[PDB]
Structures are given as structure tokens and as C-alpha cells.
Amino acid sequence: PPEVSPVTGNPVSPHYIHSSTLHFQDVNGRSLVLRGVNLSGSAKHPNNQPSHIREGFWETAEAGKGDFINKPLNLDDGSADLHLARLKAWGYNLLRYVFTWESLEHAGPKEYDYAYMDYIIAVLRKCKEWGFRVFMDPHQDVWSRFTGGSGAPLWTLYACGIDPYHLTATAAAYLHCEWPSAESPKPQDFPAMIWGTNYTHLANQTIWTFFFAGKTYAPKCIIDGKNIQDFLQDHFIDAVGELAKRIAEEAGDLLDECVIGWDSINEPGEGLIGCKDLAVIPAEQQLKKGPSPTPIEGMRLGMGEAQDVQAWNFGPMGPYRGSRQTIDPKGVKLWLSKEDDVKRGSGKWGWTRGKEWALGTCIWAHHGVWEIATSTLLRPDYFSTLPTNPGHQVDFVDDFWALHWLAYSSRIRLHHPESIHFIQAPVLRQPPKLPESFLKGRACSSPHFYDGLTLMTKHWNWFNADAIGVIRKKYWSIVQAVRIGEGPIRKMIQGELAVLKQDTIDILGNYPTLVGEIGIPYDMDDKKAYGYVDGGRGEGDYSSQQKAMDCSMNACDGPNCLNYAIWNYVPDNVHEWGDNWNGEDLSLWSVDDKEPSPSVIDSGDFSPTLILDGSRAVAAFCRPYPVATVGIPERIDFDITSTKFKYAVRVRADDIANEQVYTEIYLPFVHYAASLNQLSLDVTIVASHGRVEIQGQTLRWWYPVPGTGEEVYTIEVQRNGGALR
Ligand SMILES: CN1C[C@H](NC(=O)Cc2ccc3c(c2)NC(=O)CO3)C[C@H]1CO
Ligand SMILES: [Mg+2]
């Protein structure tokens, strides 16, 4: 690695993690692997406002409030250190830190919650004191909580001319708090993983088109003298930059040593950009479930007109058409009236709206996309090209997302000069070619991956299918994408993670890859493992959950040897409501599943209750792996049943190896302890070269580099006497 930064040309801190090659590297040239969790989804919503509670949901946000203090970690009751000790004891060295635009700018435009950013600083310092590397996640889901997920403050909806209280009657967004109606909600009946379909309902279809391309498809949406595009992007970027600046000015010791970089905006929605025909839902749209209006059908509903729409079920091979369904808004419109914009919109939050921004009527009709009098669609391919140049067919990633990233990454570097750009292309899209003028040899691909079949069906199936192959039309038929049996399924999923690596080197360059999100649902089979069904039979049996996560985790091993962050870790998770967000339940830990310095955790002299009590399928997500390596990682293999761990390293004659520069491997007590009834490893170790040493949950491996060329060394570990109970 170089002696100066490829971004600034200055010398680097000793803690610097290089991100200019296919692997993270410390200053001694050791390849680093960073593995951990997202902390935390609990930060998606304010205190006492879980997704399923409607009381106070709208009122507090209307008053400009947004109390996220002590999320994700309560710094007042001493629980924060225990949680971090548990994560560190599981061997994690990485945290994807979750924060929302709402939590920063809920009071109003440019009225930032500086107390909450100080809280974030206070949490990040504990993380630094516990030895975690962190990168920051500006997080959202289907734009905002008020459109069915998480992210942006309520006032952005009014800024877009939308009356939040008409979203349900229009079916422009499905809110857990208001399912099936705002009058008689039954949050527990909220269909599984339906919240994601909000991306293909009118509110998100509109707002995301504004955000990434307002100047192109909505040129008459002027707000404060700017197109809504700049209004929204400036305000989102300014907010995140305001947090980075604060950290830079008030806690600069965090930068690079702990906070190594910033993720791009989370899973950005595409809106209607690229829609080839507003009259149909393309067969390529992979996710359909429940009532699924086409774009024009949703717009007609947005004007209060009843529509008979197709409903979709999710079957073993993906969505398929069920029965048709009639949505009747009974005349209720989605669009804020002029009167309400004065009382609740522009006049309340403090902006001026342009004369040509028609209110109380559909904004796409106002731009000639369809005619309201006849309810007829006029320009079905309007988002397919540029109105100014119909010859150019749009690519959302290249033409709109990339331009946003350019402005976003610039701000990040402005306040965090040595920041790694963790590049998150839109879900299941390849990243764009980005200019080295902006990457500057300090970037990492941060794609997400989920076992999609397992996540939608909340079941570990005896079959599975190659999602990425289907998207890339690899197979003549979707049936040829199916695999049967653990082996084939695991090999298939490992091959899917390999595509993420291929995307990086082919497109971005010789940079590392890190799976920013990966995980499996624990609320499987109607919560049999929580004891909810079959007269309580199966309570505590996480066999299916353990196999699903073991398969996802194994996919990051093999030849991939990937960095990743598991989704997720929710201190306030419970069996009844899961993660308290849209019925998702992906937490590794729950108080409902229960029956201290850093130095003591490094010592291994802690109680086994810390690493097991409250965990779910801990055998799958707490695994051996090499934190730092002299050379390049070539292959990781770990087997729960036998506890057998095998790691191959490609060592090169030019690599640096000596007494203080060695390979370090985490060996979890969970799999290798003598007993879990001090704690100690009870293992047999076989190394092709060099010597080894054991203390706590840490294995140190000294070996010499080859005299010339490169050779592959191996180390094998296995618990004495089989696996634990
Ligand atoms: C657990 N929830 C799930 C949700 N995010 C997504 O669903 C996006 C996604 C990414 C990668 C994927 C697929 C989907 N689908 C595939 O089939 C394989 O790769 C948000 C997250 C936390 O709240
Ligand atoms: Mg103002």
C-alpha cells in the first residue's frame, strides 16, 4: 500500500484502512476482512412510534417533532455497552450505522436536530472505544415512514404537493399503521413483505421521479425558485453533510480510525423513470404482491376515480396473478389542494411554490401524460425518453442516480476528506461507471443481497431459485433457475454473491466489495419457534432459521471471502411485532429469547450467557473468519455440524511478515469452547506452514513468505470431541 492517501496525497494515520485494491488493507499490507451487523433498524422510527401504532404517528411529525434519542443504543441505562460487548464477543469488527433524514431535519427545512447528532457522536465514540470500524448509512425505505417505510421528514410530502392523509384511500401508499383502513386498522394482518411494493404505488412513483429527475419530467414543479429535484436533493445532501461536518468539527478523532466512510442513499427508488409503457406492469418488475395498479391506474386512483386492478400472490416461483380487485377512493384525491398548501404546506413549512405547479390535481396529467376529462393516457412512453430529445432512451442508473451520487460524494469528501465511498447502486442494478476524478482510489462496492425466496415466504424451502440469473435472463425458463437440496441451493447462493464481486471489478475498478445488507427472517412458519402455533410445539427450534442464515453466510465464504454487515440487530425486537417495522423480523437477538470491559472480552473471560442468551440461530451467524491476513484470502470453509474450519491464504514473496505482522483469525467460543455451561478454546489446529498461538477467541498465525513467486498456505481448525450442545 502507498505511503500517502490517493485522495489528498497526505500521509495516513496508522489506523488507515486502504481501499485502493480488491481488498481492504492496513498500513502493513495485511488484507482485512470486515464483518458485522447493521445497527440498527430500530433507528428507523422515533421512540414509541413503531410501524403498527397509529396513535401520535401523524400528529407528532406534523408538529415538527422527531425524538430518536437513545436509538439504536440507550446511553442512560448501561445497556449500550452490553450490546456492544456481545457483538464484539461474536467476533464482529464492523457496524453499518443507521440514521435517517427525518431524525436530522424533522423540525423543518434547515432546522437540524443537533442534539441527535451529538447523540450519534456519543454512540460512535462508544463504538470506537469497543474497537469497531463504522461506515454511515443514510437510510430510507419507500421514501419515508409516511409513505410506508423510513427516511425522509414528513414535510417533504407537502413539498411534493401530496396530502399525506389521502394516501390510503388512493392506494398511493400502504401504511402498516392504516392497514386495511385508517378507520379500523388491523396491523397484524399486514401481508408479509408487502411494504416493498410501495415503490410501485403512486406516492413513491411520483416522489422518486421528482427526486432524481424533477427537472426532466416535472419542469413546472418549482419550489423556492428551484425545481423540486434540486429542492429535495440539496436538502437531503445538506442534511447528511451537516452531520459529517459536525463529526469533523466536534469529534474529528472518529474519522478514519472508526468512521471509515459513508454509504450512498439507501436502496433509492426509481419512480417512473424508465417506464416503457405506463399502461402495463412489465414482466421484468420482479416484485408484485397484493393490489397492484399499473402506473396509469394508480394515477386515476390519485384523482379519486375507482379502478379494477390486478392483485398478485407470491408463489413458489415468484409472483403470479390472482383475482382482480376494485379500489374505490370515492372521489378522495391524493393531491394537496391550494387551500391546504397554505394551511399545511408551503405556508406552514416556509417555502414558495411556483405558479405553474398545479395543486389539487394530478401533476403528471398537468404535464400532458394523460387527460383527466377523458381519463385517457396520452404519452404512455413519457418516462422512456427525454421530452427534450425523444431519441435518447433513459438509463436510471447512468442518467440520474449517478449524477446524484456525484453531488453527494463531493459533500462527503468536503467534510470527511479521507472518506471511503461505499457505493450502493440501486437494488439489483449494476453500478454505473464512475470517474476516478471522484473515486480517487478510495471506494468500496456496497451492494445488498437477500435470499429473496426465504424472505418473502418466511420459510426455509427445500427448493430455491437463482434470482440474479432470472433478472439477467440467463435461463430459457424460470423453472431452469430452480435448485433442490441444501448443497445445490448453497452452491447457487454462493454463485450469486460472486456476481456482486464481478460487478465491482468489471465496472467500478479494482476495489473491495462489502455486502452492506444480508440476512434472513426469523418469524418463519407463523412463528412456530416463538411457540405461537401447534399448541406451542417447536418453540425454540431455530433449525430452519439456522440453515437459511448458514446458507447466506456460507455464500460470503468460499472463494468470495466477502466483507459484509448482517441485517440486523434490534435491541427492542420482540416476538409479537418483530423488529417493530412492517412485520420484518431479522434481528439476531431478542429479549423474548432470554432464559464488562473490552479488555475482558478480548480476554475471553466473560460469561457464556452474553453470547447465547437472547440469540437466535447463533451457530449460523457467529463464525470463524480471518480478521487480518498476511497475503490474500483464497478460500474460507466452515461447517457447523463438524465445526471444521479451513482457510487458504495466497502468500507472496513480497508480502510483509514478521513478529508483529501476522495473520489473525477469530475462533468463536460458540463453536469451539470447551464448554458453555473460564471460557477456553478446545481445538485441534493443523497449519501447512509456520506456528500458531491461541488466547481467548483469537488465533495468531505466523509464517514466512515464499522465497519467490507465490504459494498457498492452509490452516484447519476443529473442536475436540465434536460439536457443542
Ligand atoms: C430485510 N429488509 C429487506 C429490504 N430490502 C430489499 O428487499 C432489497 C433487496 C436486496 C437484494 C436482493 C433482493 C432484494 N432480492 C433478491 O431476490 C436477492 O437480492 C430491506 C431490509 C431491511 O428492512
Ligand atoms: Mg425555512
mmCIF file of C-alpha atoms in Angstrom, residues 1 36 49 78 90 203 218 225 229 255 297 332 346 362-363 386-387 424 519 527 534 624 638 651 661 718:
data_model
loop_
_atom_site.group_PDB
_atom_site.id
_atom_site.type_symbol
_atom_site.label_atom_id
_atom_site.label_comp_id
_atom_site.label_asym_id
_atom_site.label_seq_id
_atom_site.Cartn_x
_atom_site.Cartn_y
_atom_site.Cartn_z
ATOM 1 C CA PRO A 1 0.000 0.000 0.000
ATOM 2 C CA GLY A 36 -20.555 -7.265 11.469
ATOM 3 C CA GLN A 49 -43.834 5.186 17.264
ATOM 4 C CA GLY A 78 -25.972 0.917 30.790
ATOM 5 C CA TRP A 90 -19.313 -12.672 18.468
ATOM 6 C CA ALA A 203 -46.755 8.272 -3.983
ATOM 7 C CA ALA A 218 -41.763 17.701 -13.950
ATOM 8 C CA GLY A 225 -37.117 29.185 -7.179
ATOM 9 C CA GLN A 229 -35.403 17.885 -7.846
ATOM 10 C CA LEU A 255 -12.753 9.951 11.320
ATOM 11 C CA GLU A 297 -54.370 3.018 -12.951
ATOM 12 C CA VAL A 332 -60.744 11.394 -2.467
ATOM 13 C CA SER A 346 -45.917 25.996 1.680
ATOM 14 C CA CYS A 362 -52.575 15.097 -10.752
ATOM 15 C CA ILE A 363 -49.171 16.565 -11.607
ATOM 16 C CA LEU A 386 -36.166 12.742 -22.625
ATOM 17 C CA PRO A 387 -39.056 15.064 -23.605
ATOM 18 C CA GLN A 424 -24.668 1.374 -3.323
ATOM 19 C CA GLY A 519 -29.958 -11.676 6.477
ATOM 20 C CA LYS A 527 -43.751 -18.119 14.420
ATOM 21 C CA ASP A 534 -49.407 -26.133 17.072
ATOM 22 C CA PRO A 624 -14.714 -18.264 12.427
ATOM 23 C CA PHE A 638 -16.821 -23.569 7.770
ATOM 24 C CA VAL A 651 1.153 -15.686 0.363
ATOM 25 C CA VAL A 661 2.755 -8.575 11.344
ATOM 26 C CA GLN A 718 -11.874 -28.250 14.609
#
